[PDB]
């Protein structure tokens, strides 16, 4: 049947400006990854596809601290090029627990790198396994 | 089928003849594992608390104490 | 091919006479390192090379204060024997931030330890992650 994948935050909270490489979340946990269709690159945090198809991609990030912005925002990048975007206005300078979810569907080609990228630098993200996750589902054949 | 070479406390896996090994942990990070990657210290403002046990590199995560930096006093995540 | 290492200071401001044992800088935060060619001793501040080779070793120390000496200095030592030495005369009793860089090539045998050793003086070092660093490049093998 269809192949799915559900990555999770492995535990501790991160600082985008220090713990990340270009705002890309890389601390993932392959809990229910199908090996026939998906391949995760741990150091980069890219979800690579192996089969050309139609993919429903979902993601959620828990942002709790921001400096110099008035709003937190992230992109679901398809080969370092934006597809979806989730933005949330958050009180700047103080702790604000907010999970930010975005999902969409698009046609993909094999060996395609999908990633979660924060547009701002001064963000504190809680990489919890229940508040931060990244997933994809091969629905079927590409029209 | 042998076990992957375990890492010491305050050291995380270095994956890459294969040069797989174990590298130490950065300044505000720790590792209580054999295959656990290095993770940041517990947040004082993420929990709204203060630091009773200052964190270190190994088997040493930050342990919070009370939380009055405005005036938060509850058991796990405390608030005003 | 080539194996490298770059260590950074961990923020805090060291006073050498009160915070170090023999002037050796020990609080190095590893940001890049091959554990197959390099090994880091945290309590001693040594950087051990695990294989024979030709090494390019570099260091930078940010000195911000000096007391009754006006002569801030340090050495890149191998097995406690100096190799490089960086000197810097500064106005005493005044905060003067200034980074001190030195680098050089040398042949090393397996198990040799490299360290950054300050001179015994009342010097103040700002161990920032960008102003205070220590690294090396194993260029290749050490011939004969």
Query: How many residue contacts between B and C have a Cβ separation below 8 Å?
Result: 29
In chain C the first and final C-alpha atoms are separated, in Å, by 21
Which among C10, C11, C35 has the least Cβ separation from residue B22? C35
Of A76, A138, A75, A78, residue with least CA distance to A112: A78
Q: What is the largest CA-CA distance in chain B?
A: 57
Residues of chain A with Cβ-Cβ distance to B15 below 8 Å are: 42-43
Q: Do B40 and A126 touch (CB under 8 A)?
A: no
**Shortest Cα distance, chain A CAs vs residue B15, angstroms:** 9
User: What's the rounded Cα separation, in Å, for the pair C143 and C135?
Assistant: 22
Q: Do B26 and C35 touch (CB under 8 A)?
A: no
Q: Do B39 and A10 touch (CB under 8 A)?
A: yes
Q: Do A95 and B45 touch (CB under 8 A)?
A: yes
Interface of A with B (CB under 8 A): 10-15, 19, 27, 42-43, 64-65, 95, 124, 126
The verdict on B37 touching C (C-beta cutoff 8 Å) is no
Distances from the Cα of B13 to the Cα of A4, B8, C121, angstroms: 28, 9, 39
User: What's the rounded Cα separation, in Å, for the pair C38 and C54?
Assistant: 13
Distances from the Cα of B40 to the Cα of A12, A81, B9, angstroms: 6, 29, 14
- Under 8 Å CB-to-CB from C16, ≥6 apart: which residues? C23, C118, C120, C121, C122, C123, C124, C125
Q: Is C130 left (phi over 0), alpha (psi -120 to 50) or beta?
A: alpha
- With DSSP H G I counted as helix, E B as strand and the rest as coil, what are the percentages for chain C, rounded to 5? 5, 60, 40
The pair of structure tokens assigned to B76 is: 């796990």
Distances from the Cα of C8 to the Cα of A83, B47, B57, angstroms: 37, 29, 15
How many residues comprise chain C?
Answer: 144
* Residues of B (40-79) whose Cβ lies below 8 Å from A: 40-43, 45-46, 48
Delimit the domains of chain C by residue range: 1-144
The DSSP line for C43-70 is TTTEEEE-S-EEEEEEEEEEEEEEES--
Substitution target from B23, B54, B56 for chain C, most C beta carbons within 10 A: B23
Resolution (A): 2.8
């Amino acid at each position: 049947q269809p192949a799915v994948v559900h990555l999770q935050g492995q535990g501790s909270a991160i600082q985008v400006k220090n713990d990340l490489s270009g705002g890309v979340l890389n601390d993932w946990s392959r809990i229910t990854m199908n090996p026939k269709v998906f391949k995760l690159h741990p150091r980069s945090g890219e979800l690579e596809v192996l089969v050309d198809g139609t993919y429903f991609i979902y993601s959620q990030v828990e942002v709790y601290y921001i400096n110099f912005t008035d709003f937190a925002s992230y992109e679901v990048v398809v080969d370092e090029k934006p597809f979806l975007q989730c933005t949330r206005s958050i009180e700047t300078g103080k702790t604000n627990y907010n999970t930010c979810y975005t999902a969409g569907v698009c046609l993909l080609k094999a060996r395609q790198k999908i990633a979660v990228k924060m547009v701002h630098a001064d963000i504190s993200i809680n990489m919890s396994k229940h508040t931060t996750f990244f997933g994809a589902i091969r629905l079927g054949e590409a029209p | 089928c042998q076990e992957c070479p375990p890492c010491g406390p305050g050291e995380e896996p270095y994956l890459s003849d294969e040069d797989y090994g174990c590298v130490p942990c950065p300044a505000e990070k720790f590792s209580k594992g054999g295959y656990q990657i290095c993770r940041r210290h517990k947040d004082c403002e993420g929990f709204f608390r203060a630091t009773v046990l200052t964190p270190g590199d190994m088997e040493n995560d930050a342990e919070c104490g009370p939380c009055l930096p405005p005036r938060n006093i509850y058991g796990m995540v405390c608030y005003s």
